[PDB]
């Protein structure tokens, strides 16, 4: 055991030296002369009410109009953002809901929680209602994130050291990824859906190849649990929000961290991270009931979105990039334009 | 607006009405989170995946959850139980060997950043077993807890002294950690006690009474 530990330490030292040998200058030095971004003021265009309990997750959908939101009341609602109308309100078997996902085609919606089961609901039914299509069971631990590759394949992240890919038809795990040490808290699919990343409760974000089911790289720059991850729109970088009140930007091509977004007035951890259409405004939701907008190329703080009376649990940006929807623990969703 | 938009608005209004009715129906049941150890016997305190137990006392419905089948690290799913009425905490008192661990657990769940508003209802089970061990046998709390030697009482006096010492040890952490946001409710229950439901009912009654008093700024 001692020989293996020594070999692992030597390999880690070699990896660190190789990473250091390829860091000519920080991205901050490169973009020091870049023209800055003025203060951004976004007002609450819409307020969506009717959950009566803490909201835990939300997802927009391929079109930038419909939305889905999951709360601990025991219901999963679908909103028409342009008119604040409720398209659907699906009751759930278990009231402990931790995640929700909207299919790219809009046909199905997935949800999960403490029941260690991913429930998939079919929206467009001949009977005229919403009924449970599938109940993918396993994972021996609570679900924390679900993402749809297409109408037949899903990816789930659980509360153990395991992510999985499910064939919705058969219901069996086509592939399982086991490289983590703590709970996997978030998930983000690549734009081409050939890779993804997973941030775990051990200060580690791992890059998984969705085909062979093996870990490609691991990034360790944080000091506490990672609560949210998100890909850069280009697909060659991503950003992680952790519990040490600090966001970070990692690069796939050169496996290092480029910039860190943190301020001395912030002491509470991040619960949600999203980008902009151009990949310049990093929107991060904090535990101090606020959200912050970071200049992703200069690490500045270009604006504060303060309209919530409790924790900002979920935060997403539409594909069109015309809105930012933040859902908080006070049973309220707000759209900012 | 249009012909197909007023109908959508009416459908949304019906959805809102159904949601409000469901929320009103589900707001009348009090939710309690059950916590404890393997030897604490937390499964059997009230006479009749996640275990769920529904009972009724004085025309009030109580729903009790017992989260099993999950990993040891519980610092991430414990934030789900942030809106519960109370945290029932079952602790075995007849096993001093693992009493300190129980204390640690209590402290950990008492100072949590999210469980500050939730009040804890203690349940020191196996009081008869503790009395039997205190009466006969050579197993003194002095070696496990050095402070029991100098403790005096504020059944024979030995059992009462031990019971009050354990209750004081559990209540000290409850006392020096809050500013009236939540309270501890130490109870002594045997393995065949039948009044646990009434105790939970009364404690929930005054927990929500203190909540109501605090919100109207009356206290």
């Amino acid at each position, epitope marked *: 055991l001692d020989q293996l530990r020594q070999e692992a330490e030597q390999l880690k030292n070699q990896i660190r030296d190789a990473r250091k040998a390829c860091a000519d200058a920080t991205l901050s030095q490169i973009t020091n002369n870049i023209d800055p971004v003025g203060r951004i003021q976004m007002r609450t265009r819409r307020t969506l009410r009717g959950h009566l309990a803490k909201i835990y997750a939300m997802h927009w959908g391929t079109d930038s109009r419909l939305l889905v939101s999951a709360s601990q009341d025991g219901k999963l609602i679908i909103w028409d953002s342009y008119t604040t109308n409720k398209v659907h309100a699906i009751p759930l078997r278990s009231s402990w809901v931790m995640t929700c996902a909207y299919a790219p085609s809009g046909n199905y919606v997935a949800c999960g929680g403490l029941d260690n089961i991913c429930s998939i609901y079919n929206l467009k039914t001949r009977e005229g209602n919403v009924r449970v299509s599938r109940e993918l069971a396993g994972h021996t631990g609570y679900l924390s994130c679900c993402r749809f590759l297409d109408d037949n394949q899903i990816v789930t992240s659980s509360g153990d050291t395991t992510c999985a890919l499910w064939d919705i038809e058969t219901g069996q795990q086509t592939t399982t990824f086991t490289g983590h040490t703590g709970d996997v808290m978030s998930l983000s699919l690549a734009p081409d859906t050939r890779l993804f990343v997973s941030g775990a*409760c051990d200060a580690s974000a791992k890059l998984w190849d969705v085909r062979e089911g093996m870990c490609r790289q691991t990034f*360790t720059g944080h000091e506490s649990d990672i609560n949210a991850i998100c890909f850069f729109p280009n697909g060659n970088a991503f950003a992680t929000g952790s519990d040490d009140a600090t966001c970070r930007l990692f690069d796939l091509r050169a496996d290092q961290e480029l910039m860190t977004y943190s301020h001395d007035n912030i002491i509470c951890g991040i619960t949600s991270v999203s980008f902009s259409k151009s990949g310049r405004l990093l929107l991060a939701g904090y535990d101090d009931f606020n959200c912050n907008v970071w200049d992703a190329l200069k690490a500045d703080r270009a604006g504060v979105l303060a309209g919530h009376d409790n924790r900002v649990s979920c935060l997403g940006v539409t594909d069109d990039g015309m809105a930012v929807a933040t859902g908080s623990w006070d049973s309220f969703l707000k759209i900012w334009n | 607006v249009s012909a197909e938009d007023k109908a959508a608005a009416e459908r949304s209004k019906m959805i809102d009405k159904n949601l409000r009715e469901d929320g009103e129906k589900a707001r009348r049941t009090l939710r309690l989170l059950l916590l404890g150890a393997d030897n604490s016997g937390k499964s059997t305190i009230v006479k009749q995946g996640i275990f769920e137990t529904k009972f009724q006392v004085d025309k009030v419905n109580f729903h009790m959850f017992d989260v099993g089948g999950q990993r040891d690290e519980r610092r991430k799913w414990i934030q789900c139980f942030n809106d519960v009425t109370a945290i029932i905490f079952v602790v075995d008192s007849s096993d001093y060997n693992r009493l300190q661990e129980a204390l640690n657990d209590f402290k950990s769940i008492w100072n949590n950043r999210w469980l500050r508003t939730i009040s804890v209802i203690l349940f020191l089970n196996k009081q008869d077993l503790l009395a039997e061990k205190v009466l006969a046998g050579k197993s003194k709390i002095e070696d496990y807890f050095p402070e029991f030697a100098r403790y005096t009482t504020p059944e024979d006096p030995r059992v009462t002294r031990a019971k009050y010492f354990i209750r004081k040890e559990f209540v000290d952490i409850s006392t020096a950690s809050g500013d009236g946001r939540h309270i501890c409710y130490p109870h002594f229950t045997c393995a065949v006690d039948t009044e646990n439901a009434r105790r939970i009912f009364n404690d929930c009654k005054d927990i929500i009474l203190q909540m109501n008093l605090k919100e109207y700024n009356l206290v």
Partner: nanobody, 128 residues
Framework: QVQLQESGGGLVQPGGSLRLSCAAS????????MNWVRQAPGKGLEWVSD????????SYTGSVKGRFTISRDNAKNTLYLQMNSLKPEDTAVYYC?????????????????????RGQGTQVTVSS
């Protein structure tokens, strides 16, 4: 990167004194509580000692209260625990653990089986 390395364990006859040092690295030492835990041979993990961010609040377990001492050096990021009167019962593998989050007064899963932020441990044996 959040590795913690302990040193100082060895063979000590009963009544002897020992000093264990945990050299934290990869994080800001001044923001997190620090704990000392131990695992007996063929037993579960037992939390031994606590400490606060600056040392204002210090707590001990009942068994070793008044016999051990704990200090936290911040100029050089280290956590020291000194045992004065060792006993045959105080033989175990000692670990140096850290609270999950900064600026927080509670350490939730420090004594759990697999904890992400914990050391490899040093073995101390008493009376051979």
């Amino acid at each position: 990167q959040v590795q913690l390395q302990e040193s100082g364990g060895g063979l000590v006859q009963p009544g002897g004194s020992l000093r264990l040092s945990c050299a934290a690295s990869g994080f800001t030492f001044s923001n997190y509580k620090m704990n000392w835990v131990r695992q007996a041979p063929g037993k579960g993990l037992e939390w031994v000692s606590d400490i606060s961010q600056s040392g204002a609040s210090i707590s001990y377990t009942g068994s070793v209260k008044g016999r051990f001492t704990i200090s936290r050096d911040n100029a050089k990021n280290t956590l020291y625990l000194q045992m004065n009167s060792l006993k045959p019962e105080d033989t175990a593998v000692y670990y140096c653990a850290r609270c999950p989050a900064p600026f927080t007064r509670d350490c939730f899963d420090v004594t759990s089986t697999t904890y992400a932020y914990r050391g490899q441990g040093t073995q101390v044996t008493v009376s051979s």
